[PDB]
Amino acid sequence: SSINFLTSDDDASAAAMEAFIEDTLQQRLQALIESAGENWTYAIFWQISHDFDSSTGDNTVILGWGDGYYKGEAEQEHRKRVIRELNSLISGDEEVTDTEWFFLVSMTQSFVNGVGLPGESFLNSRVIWLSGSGALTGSGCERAGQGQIYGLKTMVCIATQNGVVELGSSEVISQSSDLMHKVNNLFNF
Ligand SMILES: [Ca+2]
Ligand SMILES: [Ca+2]
């Protein structure tokens, strides 16, 4: 089935981590990109938590997988991919494309406030809009770089009250005046 089932709530990141080695966010994420006039590949929502660093402090804000929705549009690599997909569904055939895979592996990732596109975005309450391959590879952010490797040409992070909405596409997409307001309605309240 579609990969949108493995994302929601299971403390999904833990699952993803060992596999790879407010609500419903999802429906709102789904509405967001379904409710849009550019071909977005996926939306993810990065949620805020707190860590407490060893041996010092530390009230450290951290962004982590909240949820996400994936619209969409070698053979060794592929066996590896389906294996982990079959694992993650298990805990707890059809081809696995680059964007699908990037979407899944994102479940394993987190960001110290101020660091990476999601952390920079949240720290400064910022919209960061990277459009075009050179925009991603020139960004100095390893997630943007990783996204570009997997075929993305647009990656966006928008700071919201509870976290950061991320949009990505394999197309070059300019910032729509309407798409920003939808993010307000769906993610701030
Ligand atoms: Ca969640
Ligand atoms: Ca490849």
Curated annotation (Swiss-Prot):
Assembly: Homo- and heterodimer. Interacts with MYB28, MYB29, MYB34, MYB51, MYB76, MYB122, MYC2, MYC4, AFPH2/NINJA and the JAZ repressors TIFY10A/JAZ1, TIFY10B/JAZ2, TIFY6B/JAZ3, TIFY11A/JAZ5, TIFY11B/JAZ6, TIFY5B/JAZ7, TIFY5A/JAZ8, TIFY7/JAZ9, TIFY9/JAZ10, TIFY3A/JAZ11 and TIFY3B/JAZ12.
Tissue-specific expression: Constitutively expressed in roots, stems, leaves, flowers, and seedlings.
Domain of life: Eukaryota
Region ranges (JAZ-interaction domain): 55-93
Deletion phenotype: Minor effect on jasmonic acid response and no effect on glucosinolate biosynthesis. Myc2 and myc3 double mutant has an increased insensitivity to jasmonic acid. Myc2, myc3 and myc4 triple mutant has no jasmonate-related defense response, is devoid of glucosinolates and is extremely susceptible to generalist herbivores.
Conditions for induction: Barely up-regulated by jasmonic acid.
Function as written in the Swiss-Prot or TrEMBL entry: Transcription factor involved in tryptophan, jasmonic acid (JA) and other stress-responsive gene regulation. With MYC2 and MYC4, controls additively subsets of JA-dependent responses. Can form complexes with all known glucosinolate-related MYBs to regulate glucosinolate biosynthesis. Binds to the G-box (5'-CACGTG-3') of promoters. Activates multiple TIFY/JAZ promoters.
Subcellular location: Nucleus
Entire-sequence positions represented here: 6 to 237 of 592
Entry domain remark: The JAZ-interaction domain (JID) (82-141) is sufficient for interaction with MYB proteins and most of the TIFY/JAZ proteins.
Outcome (variant: D67N): In atr2D; dominant resistance to 5MT
Protein name (Swiss-Prot/TrEMBL): Transcription factor MYC3
